[PDB]
Design a protein around this ligand. Sequence first.
Ligand code: NA
Ligand SMILES: [Zn+2]
Length: 531
Amino acid sequence: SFPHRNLTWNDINFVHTTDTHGWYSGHINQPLYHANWGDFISFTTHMRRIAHSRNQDLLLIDSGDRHDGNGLSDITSPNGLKSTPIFIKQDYDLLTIGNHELYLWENSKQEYETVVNHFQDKYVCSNVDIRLDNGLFVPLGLKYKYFTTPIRGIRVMAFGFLFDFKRFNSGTRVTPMAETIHEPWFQEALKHEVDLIIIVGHTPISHNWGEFYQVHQYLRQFFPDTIIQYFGGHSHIRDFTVFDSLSTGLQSGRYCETVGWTSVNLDKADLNLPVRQRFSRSYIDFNTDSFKYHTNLDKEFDTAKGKLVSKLIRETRKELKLDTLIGYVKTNYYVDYVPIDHPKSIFNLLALKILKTLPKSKHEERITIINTGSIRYDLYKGPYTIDSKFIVSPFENIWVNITVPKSVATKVAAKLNDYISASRLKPPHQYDLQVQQEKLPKGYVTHDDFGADGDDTLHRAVVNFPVPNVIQSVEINDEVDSPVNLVFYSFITPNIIWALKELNFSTEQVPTPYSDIYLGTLLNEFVANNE
Ligand code: NA
Ligand SMILES: [Zn+2]
């Protein structure tokens, strides 16, 4: 029930999602994001119908990462078995892959067989290949799409680019977009005549990231006065970036908190329009107040399709037992509203109380290290459910260890916290922390290339502290040099090995299994107060 900023519509309109991470049920602990996928389906039904009645085109676009962060997607093996049927009920026009569809073979195979198969001609991946059962590799989806819009006959070419991701499973291949552009097939794709180029990508649109920029230079050589619109993701932020007067990028947040909006005027390049006149953007809070406002409906908002999807969500959550209560949390614990050494930090809670509950021998000295990016959400006070485990700690990381002297072990976390890591260890939004009344709800106030007013709702701006790459839980008996078990996630092995080399510690000791108990299980037992 808030005052809203108006959307600017235009020739072609874009509705954008990214980094949904299975949040199709809506948010219970942040009611500004209460709406579910059904409501969003009602929303876009009307917004398409509205656009068509105004002789305008509208396209829905998704930039990937559709699991790892929610019970709806994560409770099943493989991930997404019950959330995908919900996701694909939305009528996307273009979509691409994120890195979370690529960590495990089961996920990549699932993606190819369900999502790509469903959105056969709409799923575009230019730089990711998948292994067929016969051992040969094929593009995971289309390498590009050439099409014309149904209302205004706009001739558009679309490409799809994943960021330079290193940890893909070996049943897939990612090629950096900087190399993809010099490949034979790409030059052949550039021979088309187009009114509009769409670059969808699970890639941050930030100029500090810099991958889309290199693609932009190359495309400007061949298409010097074509409108090129980018849709990015990965880094979990609302963002909008100007490449030039004929080119911008939109990024639409995370966790179904945000529906991104962009409209473009497609009058000729000769007219020399100001970029702010040609393009407009908005970030829409994922709630029905925002959805009802922008469609101008209330009583007539709910569609029969939307209502069916919302019912399917409730039926799915019930059957997965997601709202089954495990316990109660006494106080709020935050990812980054306080720093990691503050008592209301979820990282302090982990370092002081939870990580210590990993089983230990009587005389054992250990230091346990985790990356901050393994925690995906705040731990809110009140009821803690089955779903809460996956929302906070979705990853099925087991624990390995190496035994090293205390003199070395005590230096490792500081070494890792110093350092450009091959893969990002922090929560995704923690790399854009450059910065520039009581009635308003708490939410985002985005500062992008078009200024500070893109958010569809006036908010009291939320603030984050920087967090380190890793935190440690130290369990030693004294300050005396002794053997210490350095305990960590199997996947941060390369980082530990790097740190040990930087501390000039040589060993050909390899990490050995330490514990199969997931962090999420330790969290459950801590909350329940028994085990
Ligand atoms: Na910003
Ligand atoms: Zn991602």
